[PDB]
Amino acid sequence: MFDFDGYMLRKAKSVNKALEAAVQMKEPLKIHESMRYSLLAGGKRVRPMLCIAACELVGGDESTAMPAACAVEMIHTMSLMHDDLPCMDNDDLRRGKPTNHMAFGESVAVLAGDALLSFAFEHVAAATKGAPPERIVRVLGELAVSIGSEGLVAGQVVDVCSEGMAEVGLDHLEFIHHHKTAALLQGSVVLGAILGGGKEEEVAKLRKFANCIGLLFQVVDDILDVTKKTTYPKLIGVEKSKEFADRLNREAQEQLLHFHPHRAAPLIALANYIAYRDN
Amino acid sequence: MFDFDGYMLRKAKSVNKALEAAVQMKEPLKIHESMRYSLLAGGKRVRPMLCIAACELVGGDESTAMPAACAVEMIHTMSLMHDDLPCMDNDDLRRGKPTNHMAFGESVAVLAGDALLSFAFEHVAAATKGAPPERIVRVLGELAVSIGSEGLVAGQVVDVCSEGMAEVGLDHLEFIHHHKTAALLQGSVVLGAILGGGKEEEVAKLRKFANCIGLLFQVVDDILDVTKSSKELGKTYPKLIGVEKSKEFADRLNREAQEQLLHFHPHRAAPLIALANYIAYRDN
Amino acid sequence: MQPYWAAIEADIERYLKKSITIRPPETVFGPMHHLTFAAPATAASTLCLAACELVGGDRSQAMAAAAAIHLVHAAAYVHEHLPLTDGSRPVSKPAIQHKYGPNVELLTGDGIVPFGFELLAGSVDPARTDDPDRILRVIIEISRAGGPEGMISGLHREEEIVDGNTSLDFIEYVCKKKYGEMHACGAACGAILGGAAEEEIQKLRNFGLYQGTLRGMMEMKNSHQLIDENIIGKLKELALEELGGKNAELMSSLVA
Amino acid sequence: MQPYWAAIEADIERYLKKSITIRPPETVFGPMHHLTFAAPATAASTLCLAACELVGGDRSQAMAAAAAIHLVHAAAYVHEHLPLTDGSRPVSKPAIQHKYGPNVELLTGDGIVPFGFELLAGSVDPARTDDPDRILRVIIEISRAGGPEGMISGLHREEEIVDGNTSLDFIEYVCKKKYGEMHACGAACGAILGGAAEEEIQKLRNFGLYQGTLRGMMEMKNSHQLIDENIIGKLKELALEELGGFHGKNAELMSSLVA
Ligand SMILES: CC(C)=CCC/C(C)=C/COP(=O)(O)OP(=O)(O)O
Ligand SMILES: [Mg+2]
Ligand SMILES: [Mg+2]
Ligand SMILES: [Mg+2]
Ligand SMILES: [Mg+2]
C-alpha cells in the first residue's frame, strides 16, 4: 500500500484519543494515575490496529471496534506492567522511563494492572455498540481465552519456569512464543472480525494470519540480534531461521487472499513490515 | 400531660438517623470522615428539633422539614468546628472528644467545615420533597440571612474584633448574642414555620419567639460555662450583671417568649413551650 | 440455613473442580488449580446462587457467575498476599503459606480472573434466548465490581489502616469497597440470571452491599478491636429493611 | 485579556459593589467587601453571563448566580491562603498579602458563601413563572460545585502536591476539581437561567469543565513549566467540539475564550 506508516500513525492517534477518554483520572487517584502512566505511554498500538483492521476488513466499522481495540491494549499494557515487577523481570526502566512499580510502588503497580485487566472486559461489555449481545459476549469469551492459561498467561508462565532449564527445544520455544505473543494478536484480530460481522470462514483465516505474524515477529527478532538462553538461530541457524520467516510471511499473506485487495492491504503491509525490519 | 424528655429523645433519634444518612463516607475519605466526626458525634440537636416542631405546629410534617432540619444542624456544626481552630478559640474539647482540627489537622477541619456549610444548602434545595419551589427558595434565603453578615458570622466577627474593648455595653453584648446565638435558632424556627405552610403571622410570631429563646440560650451558655465543668459541658452577661442578676433576666425572656406561643392552641404549642424550658433549664 | 449454604459451597466447588482440570502443562495449571481452591470461599458466590433460587431460577443458571465471582475473589486474594520488596504494602501478620513463588502467583492471578469470564461467555446456551443479554449484563456487573472502582478500590485503601488509630467510619468504607461491592454484585447477578425484575434486582443488590460490608466488618474485628455494635446494628437494620418466607427471610440468617 | 470578557467582568464587579455595601458594623462589612474583590476573578462567573446569551436569554438574568459563583470562589480562595499554625497544609510559597488576621478571614469566608445564596433567593422576580425553578436548580449546581465533591476535593488533593515532582495527570485532576467543576457549573447555570434545553446545558457544562481545567493548568504552568502543548491542546480541543451546534456573533465569542 502507499504510506503504511501514515496508516499506523492514524490508527494510533484515534486509539490514543479513545484510551485517554476510557481511563480518566479519579478516586482513588493513585490507582488511576498508575493505569494511565503505562497505558497512555504512547507506543505503536499494533494490537489495537490489528483489531480495527480486522473489523474494517469485513465491512466492519472502526467505531464498533474501538472499545475492544482499547481492551487489547489494556491487557498488553498490564502484562508489561506486571512483567517488569521485582519478583519477575525486575526492570527499573522501559522506553527510557522509570517502570510503573518504581514510580508508584509494587502494590499500586500490581493493583492497577489488575484494574486494567478487569476494566478490559468492562469497557468491551458496556461500551461496545453496533453489535448484538450474543456477538459481544462471544467476543468477550475470545479475549478471555487469549489471555488466560491457554494464551498470554500460559506463555508467560512457561517462560518463567524455563529460565532454569537451558535445554529448550524448538517445541518448547514455539509454545512460549505462540502463547506469550501470538495469543493476544490472535485475540485482537478475532475481535475485530466478529464485531465486524465476519463469517466463521473469514474469522478462521484471520486467526491463522495472526499466528503466522505472531511467530514471525519473534523469529525475525531473533535473526536481527545476530546480524547486528535459546533462539531460532541457535536451534536451526540463521539461514534456516530466515527460511522460516519467509514461509511465515508468505502463509500469513495467503490467509487474506480473498477479502478485498484494498481492505487487506494494511495487514499485508504489516506482515511485510514484520519481516523486513532492520531492527 | 406532655412527656418532654421522650418527645425530644425520639426527635433526636429521628434526627441523628437522617444526619448519619445524609453524610456518608465517600471519596475523598478524610474530608467526609471529618464531616461525620463532628456532625454525628452527637449533640443535643436543639436547633433541628426547633425546625421540626415549628413545622408540625403550623400544619406540616417532619418529613418535609427533615432536610432543612438537618441543614441547620450541619451549619451549626461547621460553626463550632471553626470556632475551635487555633486562629480562633484554639480548643481541645468538643462534644467530649478531641477537636476536629486536633483529630484531622487545621486544613481538613476548615475544608470539612466549608463542606458542611455548603452541603446544607444543597441538601435543603434538592432533598426537600413536599413544598413548592418558591417556598424552598424562600427558606434557602432565610437560612442564608440568619447565618451571614447580618446573622451568625456577624456575631462571631464583631465578637473576636472586640477583644480589648473593656467598655462592653449591653448593646454590644446584645448584638453579639443576638447574632452569634439567636440568629440561627431564629432561622431554624422560621425554616420550619414556612415549610409547613405557615401564614406570615405565624412565621412572624415564631420568629419573635425564637428570637426570645435566643438571648436566652446564650445567657445560659454563659451561666453553664460559668458554673458547670469543662467535662460536663463536653467542650458575657454573667460578668457585667453577675451570675445572679443573669437569672432574673433569663426568666423575663422565657415568659415573654412563651407569651408569643399563646397565638397557637396550647396543645400544639406543648413541644415549643416545652423545648423552650429545656433551653432555659438544661445541663449543657 | 446450616446445610443449605453447604450444598451451595459444594455445588460450586464441584463445578470449579470439574472446570479447572490439572493437565499439560502441569506448571501452568498446577498453580491455577491450587490457588483457585486455596482461597477461602467468599459469601458473594453463595449469595449469587441463593439469590437465583430466590427469584425462582434454577441453581445452574447462575453457576458460571458464582464460579466467576470466586475466581475474581481468588485471584485478588492471591495478589493481596504476594510478598513485596519495597514495603509499599504493609505487612499483614496473617502470613499465608506460599507453595508456588511470587512470579507464578502473580501470573496465575492474571490467569484465573479472565477464566471467570471465559466460563461466563462460554456458558451461553443457544437454546435459551435471554441467555445473551443476561450474561452480558453479568459480565459488566462482575468486571465492574472487581475493577478500580470496586474491590481494587477497597484493597488499595485497606493499606491505609493504622490499626490502633483508625476510626470505624473509615474501616466500614474499606469493608464496603473490599467486600460490599462484590456481595452486592453477587445477589444482583443471581437475580438477573434468575429472571428477576429491576425492582427485585435492586433490593437484592442493596442487601448484598450491606451484607458484604457486615461480613468483612466481622473479618476486620479479628485484628484491631474497636468492635462497636452500634455499627453492626445499623447495617443489619438497613439490610433487613431492604426486604419489602425462608429464602425471602433466610438471607437474614447471616445477620444474627 | 479580550475586550468582550473584560466588559462582562466589569459588570459583575459593579453588581457586586451594588450588593455589598460597607456599613455598621464596619468590623464585619469592611472585611466582607475587601475580601470579595481581593479574590482573583473567575471565568466560571462571567461564563454564566455569556453561556446565558448563547442559548437565547439575557445576561441580567444570570447576574445573580454569576455573583454568587464569584463569592463562593472568593470564600474558597481566602480559606486556602489561611495561615495554618500546625503545618496541616504544606506551607506553600504563595504567601499572598493579608490585610486582615486569620480569624476574620476564616469567618468572612463563611459569610461570603451564604451571601451567594442570599442574592439568589432574593433575585426571584414575582413577574416570572420559572424563576423559582431555575434559581432552585442553580442553587444546587453552585452548592454542589462548592461542595466536598467539588471545589473542596480539588483544594484537599492539591495539598498532596510537591513542587515539580508530581505528574501532569494528577495536577490536571486537581485543576479539574478546583477549577473545572466550578466553571462547568457556570456554563450550566447560565444555560439553565437563559432557559436553555438539556442537550444544550449538558454541552455548555462540558465546555466549562474543559475550559475551567485548561484555565487551571495555565496558572499551574508558572508554578512549574512542563505543560507541553499536548495537555493544553488536548483540553483546548476537547472543549471546542462540545460547542458544535451553537452559531452566532456570540457563539463564536465563547469559542474565543479557549482560542
Ligand atoms: C461557635 C458559635 C457561633 C457559638 C455560638 C452559638 C452556641 C452557643 C452554640 C452552642 O450550641 P449547643 O450548646 O447546642 O452545642 P451542641 O450542638 O454540641 O449541643
Ligand atoms: Mg519481562
Ligand atoms: Mg521485562
Ligand atoms: Mg470555645
Ligand atoms: Mg470547643
Per the CB < 8 Å rule, is B28 touching D148? yes
Contacts of C122 in chain A (CB under 8 A): 141, 144
Nearest residue in chain D measured CA to CA from A26: D173
Q: Which of D123, D245, D249, D126 is nearest to D193 (CA)?
A: D123
Per the CB < 8 Å rule, is D106 touching B111? no
3-state secondary structure of A31: helix
Contacts of C234 in chain B (CB under 8 A): 20
Q: Is A234 exposed, middle or buried (0-12, 13-18, 19+ CB in 10 A)?
A: middle
State in Å: Cα B92 to ligand 5 middle.
Answer: 6
* B82, B105, B147: residue with CB nearest D114: B147
CA distance to partner chain C, nearest, from residue B34 (Å): 10
Asked whether B71 and B121 are in contact (CB, 8 A), the reply is: yes
Nine-digit cell at B28?
475523598
Rounded to the nearest angstrom, the gap between the alpha carbon of residue C236 and the centroid of all alpha carbons in its chain is: 19
| Atom 6 (ligand 1) nearest CA | B181
Q: Which of D244, D184, D234 is nearest to D208 (CA)?
A: D184
| DSSP 8-state secondary structure symbol assigned to residue A97 | E
Asked whether A257 and A199 are in contact (CB, 8 A), the reply is: no
Q: Is any Cβ of chain D less than 8 angstroms from the Cβ of A37? A: yes
Contacts of B27 in chain A (CB under 8 A): 27-28
| DSSP 8-state secondary structure symbol assigned to residue C59 | G
Nearest residue in chain D measured CA to CA from B139: D121
User: Does the bond joining A28 to the residue before it have cis omega, within 30 degrees of 0?
Assistant: yes
Per the CB < 8 Å rule, is A148 touching C114? yes
Asked whether B112 and B100 are in contact (CB, 8 A), the reply is: yes
Distance CA B185, CA B72 (A): 9
Distance CA A39, CA A32 (A): 10
Nine-digit cell at A165?
532449564
Nearest residue in chain D measured CA to CA from A21: D238
Asked whether A51 and A192 are in contact (CB, 8 A), the reply is: yes
Write the Ramachandran bin of B199: left for phi over 0, alpha for psi from -120 to 50, otherwise beta: beta
Q: Is any Cβ of chain B less than 8 angstroms from the Cβ of A28? A: yes
How far apart, in Å, are the Cα atoms of D12 and each of D72, D79, D111, D185? 14, 22, 19, 17
Is B189 near ligand 1, meaning CB less than 6 Å away?
Answer: no
* D29, D76, D84: residue with CB nearest B149: D29
Asked whether C167 and A165 are in contact (CB, 8 A), the reply is: no
Asked whether D191 and D243 are in contact (CB, 8 A), the reply is: no
Query: Hey, what amino acid is at A142?
Result: E
Per the CB < 8 Å rule, is D135 touching B30? no
Across C113-122, b (16+ Cβ under 10 Å) vs e yields bbbbbbbbbb
Neighbours of chain C (3+ CB pairs under 8 A): A, B
Q: Is any Cβ of chain C less than 8 angstroms from the Cβ of A154? A: yes
Asked whether B153 and D111 are in contact (CB, 8 A), the reply is: yes
Nearest residue in chain C measured CA to CA from A142: C118
Asked whether B78 and B113 are in contact (CB, 8 A), the reply is: yes
Atom of ligand 1 nearest to the CA of B152: 3
Nearest residue in chain D measured CA to CA from A35: D169
| DSSP 8-state secondary structure symbol assigned to residue C41 | P
Atom of ligand 1 nearest to the CA of B184: 6
CA distance to partner chain D, nearest, from residue A52 (Å): 23
CA distance to partner chain A, nearest, from residue D236 (Å): 14
Residues B185, B191, B193, B196: what is their CA dihedral angle, to the nearest 10 degrees?
A: -150
How is chain C split into domains, by residue range? 1-256
Distance CA B279, CA B213 (A): 7
Per the CB < 8 Å rule, is D140 touching B125? yes
Per the CB < 8 Å rule, is A29 touching D173? yes
Per the CB < 8 Å rule, is C28 touching A153? yes
Contacts of A28 in chain B (CB under 8 A): 27
> Ligand 2 (ion): which residues have CB within 5 A?
A 83, 89
Bridging pattern class, strands A93-94 and A97-98: antiparallel
CA distance to partner chain D, nearest, from residue A31 (Å): 11
Distance CA A132, CA C135 (A): 13
* C82, C109, C117: residue with CB nearest A144: C117
Q: Give a three-class secondary structure readout of chain B.
A: CCCHHHHHHHHHHHHHHHHHHHCCCCCCHHHHHHHHHHHCCCCCCHHHHHHHHHHHHCCCCHHHHHHHHHHHHHHHHHHHHHHHCCCCCCCCCECCECCHHHHHCHHHHHHHHHHHHHHHHHHHHHHCCCCCHHHHHHHHHHHHHHHCCCCHHHHHHHHHCCCCCCCCCCCHHHHHHHHHHHHHHHHHHHHHHHHCCCCHHHHHHHHHHHHHHHHHHHHHHHHHHCCCCHHHHCCCHHHHCCCCCHHHHHHHHHHHHHCCHHHCCHHHHHHHHHHHHHHHCCCC
Binding residues of A for Mg(2+) are 83-84, 89, 91, 159, 221, 225
3-state secondary structure of D63: helix
Asked whether C60 and C128 are in contact (CB, 8 A), the reply is: no
How far apart, in Å, are the Cα atoms of B148 and each of B177, B194, B221, D109? 14, 20, 21, 10
CATH class in words for C1-256? mainly alpha
Torsion D23-D24-D28-D30 (CA) sign: positive
Per the CB < 8 Å rule, is C79 touching A157? no
Q: What Å resolution does this PDB entry report?
A: 2.4
Return all residues near C67 (Cβ < 8 A) that are at least 6 apart.
Answer: C12, C15, C16, C19, C45, C116, C119
Query: Hey, what amino acid is at B45?
Result: R
Distance CA C229, CA D211 (A): 49
Q: How many CB pairs under 8 A join B and D?
A: 173
Per the CB < 8 Å rule, is D176 touching A25? yes
| Atom 17 (ligand 1) nearest CA | B43
Asked whether D50 and D44 are in contact (CB, 8 A), the reply is: no
Return all residues near D36 (Cβ < 8 A) that are at least 6 apart.
Answer: D16, D20, D70, D71, D74, D112
* A32, A110, A147: residue with CB nearest C82: A110
Write the Ramachandran bin of D163: left for phi over 0, alpha for psi from -120 to 50, otherwise beta: left
State in Å: Cα B76 to ligand 1 middle.
Answer: 7
3-state secondary structure of D93: coil
| DSSP 8-state secondary structure symbol assigned to residue D180 | I
3-state secondary structure of A93: strand
Mutate to test the pocket of ligand 1, among B44, B74, B175 (most ligand atoms within 8 A of CB): B44
Q: Which domains does chain A have, with CATH numbers?
A: 1-279 (1.10.600.10)
Contacts of D176 in chain A (CB under 8 A): 25
Distance CA A46, CA A10 (A): 12
Solved how?
A: X-ray
CATH 3.40.50.10380 fits D1-259, yes or no: no
Per the CB < 8 Å rule, is B117 touching D110? yes
Q: Which of A238, A198, A204, A205 is nearest to A219 (CA)?
A: A238
